[PDB]
Amino acid sequence: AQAEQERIRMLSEAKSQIADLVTLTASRVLGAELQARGHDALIAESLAA
Amino acid sequence: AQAEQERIRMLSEAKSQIADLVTLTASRVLGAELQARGHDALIAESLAAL
Amino acid sequence: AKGVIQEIIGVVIRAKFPEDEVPEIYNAIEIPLGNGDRLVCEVQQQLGNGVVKAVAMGSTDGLRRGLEVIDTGRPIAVPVGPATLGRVFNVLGDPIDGMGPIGPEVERRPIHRDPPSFEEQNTQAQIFETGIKVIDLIAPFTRGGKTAIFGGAGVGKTVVIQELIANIAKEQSGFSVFAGVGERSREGNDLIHEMKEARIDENTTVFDKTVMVFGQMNEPPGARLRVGLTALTMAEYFRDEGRDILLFIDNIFRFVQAGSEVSSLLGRMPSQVGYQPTLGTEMGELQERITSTKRGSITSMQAVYVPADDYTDPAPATVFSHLDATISLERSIAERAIFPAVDPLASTSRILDPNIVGEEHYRVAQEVKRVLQRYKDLKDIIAILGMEELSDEDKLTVQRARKIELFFSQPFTVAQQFTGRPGKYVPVKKTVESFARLLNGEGDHIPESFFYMQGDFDDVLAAYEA
């Protein structure tokens, strides 16, 4: 149950999901221009898990 | 001590799953955002490198 | 998949596959045999363009070059689970007993798994209390450690094998695995079926509490080579379930010889007696998954046939490199002691050190070995001179050594030619104090002949009272 609670907190996007996705995008895809054309909502749009 | 180790064992699989899922979601963000940002504009980097 | 047989030389075939989707090493390619049955060959090498050299693991007499070959995409699948308990299998995991096939719902694991990682190993060695008196005292087992049993056609090997399963079920989980590497079809398979099914404890046959895997003499070298790994794969399920498992491998030397034959057939250069160049690595693939992990543990007991009398022989040498204890069944004591005939002087154990089994156990074991060594030294004097020339303070030790060699008898719950004595399970805690008291002067009154299968020092006092 403790791991379930911690994993629920992590799956809650605000914990790390959006931040990690944005950091990885800025690091790899584009020079701080990950959004580039569109992708404004697409960003973490399908981050179901 | 052994119960702490056993709990970590289940957490270890959960931690690896969480890390893999986070990184895969970050990759899929690029994959999903690729269509909007440009489907086949990546050849520019390859031309400079090659 | 869907290759074709390119070449058949004895039990070594070469199947040609497309340039892509070639089988990996140890991929268990399967050849249909024009009926429900099939020939399973294990890939051992990749050659040229899509050609893979594989060992037959079967008759390979009805085959013709050009037959369809089906790649299974993984090593030889082996059924695992409680569905394997009380069943008898060959190397491929198919059942060879009268019952029907295992069925598709049962989990199948690859035969070729990796050993437990470094972090999963147990830092501290723990004794595997067997329940025997001489063994639990002179050559204690190690939980997750390899143990050797010598003597060839001695006495008490088989009864100890069944008694350990009986005790492991009584104390530990109980589940056991017998890996009959090069097991004779008559001597070692039907007779052991009857012995296990007839042997019963708490209304449960020992057969129902064990899973038996047989790589027979008649099967090609590949089957005898990989039957040990099949048995390990069956045991590792129960180990992963947290249970303590005892794995019996019959004549690990036959596993070594099967490996040597496979290497010779594959064309590899020989090594140092003609053995396989990959002797250490093959003996390490086996006998390294036999460890005590955090979750569970696989203790083992491997019969070892020393080629001739050369223990330095690469085969017993590489086996001894992987052994934690040795039990030496000797013929001379086997002349009359059909109860466990372990030679206490020739049977050693790594774990028998003060740090692990305690100071008391080490002290008692060393004192027993000292007394028995004194008797061994004075045996010639007794034979030549007699009891009278032997001075005081040693005649006591000779009588005590006679009594203590007689007190290495154990009444078993399950036995061959059942003597009727009730079964007894004596922990190490009882054995250490019992032998300490036997060495402390107590028990000097009862005559030497009334130590047959007594079991405990409290039982010694009870027997003296009557």
Next chain:
Amino acid sequence: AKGVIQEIIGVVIRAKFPEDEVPEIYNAIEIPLGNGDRLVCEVQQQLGNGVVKAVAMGSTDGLRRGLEVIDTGRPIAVPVGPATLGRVFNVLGDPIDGMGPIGPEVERRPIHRDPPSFEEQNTQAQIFETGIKVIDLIAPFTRGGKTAIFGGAGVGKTVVIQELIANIAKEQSGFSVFAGVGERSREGNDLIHEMKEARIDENTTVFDKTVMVFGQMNEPPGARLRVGLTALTMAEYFRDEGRDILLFIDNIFRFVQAGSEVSSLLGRMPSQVGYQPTLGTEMGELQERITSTKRGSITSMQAVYVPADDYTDPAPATVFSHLDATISLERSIAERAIFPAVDPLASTSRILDPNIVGEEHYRVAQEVKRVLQRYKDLKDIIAILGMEELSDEDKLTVQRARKIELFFSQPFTVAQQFTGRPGKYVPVKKTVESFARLLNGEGDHIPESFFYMQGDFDDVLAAYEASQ
């Protein structure tokens, strides 16, 4: 010139050259290797289409295929002359000591030279005094004659060589050359430098009269395979101009072993125990250059390592016929702390002849071998039954044989660290007198424990008298 590497098999580099510019069999081809330093390979076999096979003589573990190879057109040339005295060289003749490189004006000679002809051989021979009892009595060394010390791993080959150098390398009457092939870089050299610079003959150290080539074990096979020839080229210049040369080559067996490894990499068919088919020829090419000719004399003193304790191995087996004096070191004798460890029965010499070494010396040595034999014959009888079942004379000869075994032990100046006793220099005359007295019956009353690590018989008598 200007070839390209085709294959890199171990330290065997296959290189292709233009059809009309192929290197000769023993030319030295060079890979630039970058960084301003080159890798000098020695050709061994001329294959088809300007293809040659060369032995790397270096690390060769960071170089790719297709690399440029430069053909020098001449074999490995090494400096010779007085400029090489007091210096330390590689297999290639490049100095590895701190001093500067050898200037161009110094003559360079190929390391692959024909040995002296039959007409040039020098048959003259006389005893070379070493100060070691067992060597001076059983297998006397020859001045200008080849001798070798055979032994396993733990037995004292190198200590014997070091004591020998400390004994005879001061009164050289000439120069000397040392060649520790495939030897430990700890003791083989940099511990012998200490003693060779500590010894001072006359205002000049023994090192100042020594040329030194190493090619220690750390080196790849090619260096160990050609370092012997480099050292012989260094020594041959001094031999040819009349200077008496002392030549110490260490573990000729590593020369043979490096040859075996190179041959295995070269694709030759192995002979006997994995050894090269050209074992005898390579051995002869190395050893026929170790000869005292009419112009000058070389007093060679080799060491040989026998695989484990095997004396029938092909390498020592080929060495045995290339010697004037043979010495065998036994593991069993060394384990008994009789550390000079020379087996008198397995050790012989050509100049153990009454015309050369003297009639009394010859008689004493032959008697000390007869007595030693009697003991080897009675060894099992003593082993199981006991000493008492022998006859009185057999018993006496057994006791005298044990005393002789103990008496060949001798403390060495270089071995003072192991046995606290100081080193003893026993002249050959005193050795002959001591063993003649021991055989005569004198010293029979003395317990055998007093013959251990002593000098001449007078020291044994003094020790017994001090013990009363």
Next chain:
Amino acid sequence: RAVDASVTSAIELSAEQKERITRELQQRYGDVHVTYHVDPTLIGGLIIRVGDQVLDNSLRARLSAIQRVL
């Protein structure tokens, strides 16, 4: 001529993209024997294996991040 290119980009390429790729190979020959496998798993780039030399700009920085993170 004899060099062989093995291009693998995520999405199938139009004719103009293929011709742009061929013009990209003017550094070696212009039009070498080029084979375009799809490999949709890779994203955001193309693996040009000209001769025995590969050029990796597709998906492998993110997978290096996976390798380090996992």
Next chain:
Amino acid sequence: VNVGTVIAVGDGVARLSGLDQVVASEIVEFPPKAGRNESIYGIALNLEQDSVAAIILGDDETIEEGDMVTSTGRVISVPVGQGLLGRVVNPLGQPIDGKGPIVYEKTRPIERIAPGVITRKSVDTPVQTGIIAIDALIPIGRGQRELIIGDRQTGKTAVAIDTILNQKGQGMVCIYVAIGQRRAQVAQVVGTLERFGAMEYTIVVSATASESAALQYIAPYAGCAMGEEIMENGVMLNGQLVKDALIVYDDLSKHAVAYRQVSLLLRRPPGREAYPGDVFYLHSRLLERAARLNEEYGGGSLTALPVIETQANDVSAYIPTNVISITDGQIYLESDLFNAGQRPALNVGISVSRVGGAAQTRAMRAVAGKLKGELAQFRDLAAFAQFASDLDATTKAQIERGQRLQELLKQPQYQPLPVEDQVAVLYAATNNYLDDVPVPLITKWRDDFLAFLRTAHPEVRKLIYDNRLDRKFPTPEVKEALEAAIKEFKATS
């Protein structure tokens, strides 16, 4: 960037067609594919034409024909530096203890030519093993190569681990390379090192018996490269830069067996005992890297403690004689002595240290020369002891003294002794201050004496340690101080 393809996966050797511009000892990658997330490397060694055979550093079960490979542009090398300390690592340098990734700035190539001849100096500083018998009769100096040769379960690993444990405040970086050992044994060894706090300065390289024979062949070279990084550059230990390292190559017999497998599966001709012709070169190029560099070349040192397992007490085999001819000494552990209770089983007669007798504390040699003499007396008189006390009285006293000394050398496991304690104990034993003590009580007498000195007289131990380097150790002041201490202890007892 440069690539090739596997055309045949043999007996642990891939062939890698078309991988030009690969160096003769390059580490190829085999980048991960579906079904294999991690990369497994290999060593390109036979750079023949249109084929580059490569030994696979791992299980060959995972690679396949047509698999891409990527030459890394580097000769086979391992991470080195301070980050390795306290990490159990693969021969490749990858961690296996699970504590995390190895942090490192530079990587040193394994398999290099040893520093040489001129770049060396006679060993002068001692390595305190902590065993009375070894430290007194077979001194080990920093930079010395001391072979620990025995017969299966004799205590070779025990001696090596006792040595590693004793180097706590000694300014030494220990390295333990487990070659072919069982993973359970390596786990137990690492646990022993951790419980005693010796892991904070120890590196462990583990190539267990299950690991492919490609590993267990570069394991000693990986450990030696790490040790060379310590030797030349040095690491900060306890805030002090240490340029001395100690490497236990563990079982080199298993290393030779692994190389025999690698050679025979490469179809190389066998030699003596079916070993390749260059097995001696294998061990020699490995061990000769363990040196004592002179002050010009940094002044560091690398002590090697190779372990060889003999069969039936046969020291005259091939590999044991090879390593004896390579190394600078022998610590021969006898099985008969081990089973007879002399648990630090040591054949004092034939165990020797060619170099390092000078690299001993002057106190130790001044006290232990006569100890060696008395042990020689006991070994000489053991043959005459067959007679039932028919010899004379003073030699009976000599035999008894030798028995007391032999009991003194017996030392329990996992209890190293500081040099001051060792020299005080040997002074006591050699001044005839134990002749009244019965034989079975000598070990307890030693333990009680050391406890007394630790508790009652710290100053005596400090004074002995400070005065251990002087030329004439038995100075009057320390002599009388230790005399008073022992007389007080004996009166109390």
